Design an enzyme around this catalytic site. Structure first.
Site, mmCIF file in Angstrom:
data_model
loop_
_atom_site.group_PDB
_atom_site.id
_atom_site.type_symbol
_atom_site.label_atom_id
_atom_site.label_comp_id
_atom_site.label_asym_id
_atom_site.label_seq_id
_atom_site.Cartn_x
_atom_site.Cartn_y
_atom_site.Cartn_z
ATOM 1 N N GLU A 56 140.423 84.838 -12.033
ATOM 2 C CA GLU A 56 139.597 86.011 -11.785
ATOM 3 C C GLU A 56 139.886 86.587 -10.400
ATOM 4 O O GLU A 56 140.160 85.828 -9.473
ATOM 5 C CB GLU A 56 138.100 85.633 -11.877
ATOM 6 N N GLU A 60 133.121 92.946 -5.320
ATOM 7 C CA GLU A 60 131.690 92.957 -5.600
ATOM 8 C C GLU A 60 130.877 93.563 -4.462
ATOM 9 O O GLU A 60 130.954 93.102 -3.330
ATOM 10 C CB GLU A 60 131.188 91.531 -5.863
#
Ligand SMILES: [Ca+2]
EC number: 3.2.1.73
Length: 243
Positions: A56, A60
């Protein structure tokens, strides 16, 4: 899928995954204490704790600090993750203006860019463990970890994350366009929700105080909207921002 959680959020994901490339998204993020507004590459199944590898790459925006975003590479495996959280300033604030967020992934490095300018580049290390393929995703939710995102400011809901367009490029090293190592593959201007390209999250997970649902993603005026709202109030009643 539905739980008793009082709130609903959104996760947009590409139906197909790929190995390497450049991924760009022109967006205006959502932010309130307690929220997470993102863009990330994700190898579907990483969450499966069967000894499988986790793959991943993250962007964010933690709601408590809209003036920056956290970058991350998650490798290792479920229950034994290897991370590399870093923080980067964004001006104007992520929820106040549109910016072009870019993620580049090659066998040797991962690069994060904001409006074409590099804010992070990692070479080797975890990048060597980003095996397999990854899909491109975006989600908007609220974390129960007050230390990570801050106490949940429910009074600020509803919140909306706007995606003007997305561009995906194939990794064409030495064969790229304009001298670069990437060749534009496809673009979505979000004049509609294209179900032949994208899926809508319909699940939740521990630590998430919201249910990700298909009612929280829709398009209007050339923008794809991700909504974070109380259950039953997923509709957008405002004017879509201009970019
Ligand atoms: Ca658009």
């Amino acid at each position: 899928m539905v739980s008793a959680k009082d709130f609903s959020g959104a996760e947009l994901y590409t139906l197909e995954e790929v190995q390497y490339g450049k991924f760009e998204a022109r967006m205006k993020m959502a932010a309130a204490s307690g929220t997470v507004s993102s863009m990330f590459l994700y190898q579907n199944g990483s969450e499966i704790a069967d000894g499988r590898p986790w793959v991943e790459v993250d962007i964010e925006v933690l709601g408590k600090n809209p003036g920056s975003f956290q970058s991350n590479i998650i490798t290792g495996k479920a229950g034994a993750q290897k991370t590399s959280e870093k923080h980067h300033a964004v001006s104007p604030a992520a929820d106040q203006a549109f910016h072009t967020y870019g993620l580049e992934w090659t066998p040797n490095y991962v690069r994060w860019t904001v409006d074409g300018q590099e804010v992070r580049k990692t070479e080797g290390g975890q990048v060597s463990n980003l095996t397999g393929t990854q899909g491109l995703r975006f989600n908007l939710w609220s974390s129960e970890s007050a230390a990570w995102v801050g106490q949940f400011d429910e009074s600020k809901l509803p919140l909306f994350q706007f995606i003007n367009w997305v561009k995906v490029y194939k990794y064409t090293p030495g064969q790229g366009e304009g001298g670069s190592d990437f060749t534009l593959d496809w673009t979505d201007n979000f004049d509609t929700f294209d179900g032949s390209r994208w899926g809508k999250g319909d699940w939740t997970f521990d630590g998430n105080r919201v249910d990700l649902t298909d009612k929280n993603i829709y398009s209007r005026d050339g923008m794809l909207i991700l909504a974070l709202t109380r259950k039953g109030q997923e509709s957008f009643n405002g004017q879509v921002p201009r970019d």
